Design an enzyme around this catalytic site. Sequence first.
Site, mmCIF file in Angstrom:
data_model
loop_
_atom_site.group_PDB
_atom_site.id
_atom_site.type_symbol
_atom_site.label_atom_id
_atom_site.label_comp_id
_atom_site.label_asym_id
_atom_site.label_seq_id
_atom_site.Cartn_x
_atom_site.Cartn_y
_atom_site.Cartn_z
ATOM 1 N N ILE A 71 24.286 -7.438 8.523
ATOM 2 C CA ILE A 71 24.856 -7.374 9.857
ATOM 3 C C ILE A 71 23.768 -7.792 10.845
ATOM 4 O O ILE A 71 22.645 -7.298 10.771
ATOM 5 C CB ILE A 71 25.382 -5.958 10.176
ATOM 6 C CG1 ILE A 71 26.626 -5.671 9.322
ATOM 7 C CG2 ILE A 71 25.692 -5.824 11.660
ATOM 8 C CD1 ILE A 71 27.152 -4.253 9.414
ATOM 9 N N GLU A 160 27.940 -2.939 1.894
ATOM 10 C CA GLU A 160 27.587 -2.378 0.592
ATOM 11 C C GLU A 160 28.822 -2.231 -0.300
ATOM 12 O O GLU A 160 28.749 -2.475 -1.506
ATOM 13 C CB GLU A 160 26.840 -1.040 0.732
ATOM 14 C CG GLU A 160 25.551 -1.108 1.549
ATOM 15 C CD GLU A 160 24.404 -1.833 0.856
ATOM 16 O OE1 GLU A 160 24.639 -2.552 -0.142
ATOM 17 O OE2 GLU A 160 23.248 -1.681 1.309
ATOM 18 N N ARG A 163 29.603 -5.560 -1.703
ATOM 19 C CA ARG A 163 28.669 -5.904 -2.784
ATOM 20 C C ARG A 163 28.925 -5.195 -4.111
ATOM 21 O O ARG A 163 28.630 -5.751 -5.175
ATOM 22 C CB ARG A 163 27.237 -5.592 -2.360
ATOM 23 C CG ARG A 163 26.715 -6.459 -1.236
ATOM 24 C CD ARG A 163 25.452 -5.849 -0.670
ATOM 25 N NE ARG A 163 24.865 -6.658 0.393
ATOM 26 C CZ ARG A 163 24.038 -6.188 1.327
ATOM 27 N NH1 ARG A 163 23.703 -4.902 1.347
ATOM 28 N NH2 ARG A 163 23.554 -6.995 2.258
#
Length: 246
Positions: A71, A160, A163
Amino acid sequence: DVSFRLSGADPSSYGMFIKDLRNALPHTEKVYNIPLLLPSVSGAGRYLLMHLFNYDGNTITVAVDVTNVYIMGYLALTTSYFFNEPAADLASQYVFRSARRKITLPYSGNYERLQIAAGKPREKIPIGLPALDTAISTLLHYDSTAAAGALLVLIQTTAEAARFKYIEQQIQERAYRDEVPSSATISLENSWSGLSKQIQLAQGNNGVFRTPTVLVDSKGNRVQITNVTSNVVTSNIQLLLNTKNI
Ligand SMILES: *[C@@H]1O[C@H](CO)[C@@H](O)[C@H](O)[C@H]1NC(C)=O
């Protein structure tokens, strides 16, 4: 662009958002069937805009670097906010240029600096969809200490989760009740670069990691990942940081 609305959100709609987020990241190849993020992208195409809406329908737009899912900054009404780091300043050349004013946050975007600003490690910060609703609300009006905590929540419940399927699932379990992240969650966040590297190194090493990656599993037990047959590789990780950026 991708969007997520906390009003009426449930594990299904959150799953759809994280799918959209993953699918918005470009790649030209997969490595062991996992999309490989690009080494670089030039200009505005580097940044994905995530539109997030709190329960009351107020919104921020978050700018995400598509090569690493970091970000860079966000827009709240007519004010843009960017991390105090060169990649974010660069991003500020391309996104949210129409903002009436730009504030540079008094920290970079890495976990260690954010935790220092927030006054606590993210082991102690509950996450979940309610926490995300709170984070969005907090970022709507500038408060740098509050924002650091909000950003820790935001990063974990968006990037996250994109991912790692395990992290997406952890947030889905916290759809209506926040809870601090599992030790496994923290371990995976901390190991994304390392794992991405070793998975790429395994391409010409018969699926074997050049250097084993140590993780904590779902039951708090610490383990070694040595090759691509591990569940972390076959089932969990969804995006690889290009080794050219490691
Ligand atoms: C690779 O990982 C598997 C699954 O975790 C493990 O059982 C095995 O010992 C390892 N094999 C090699 C060749 O590294």
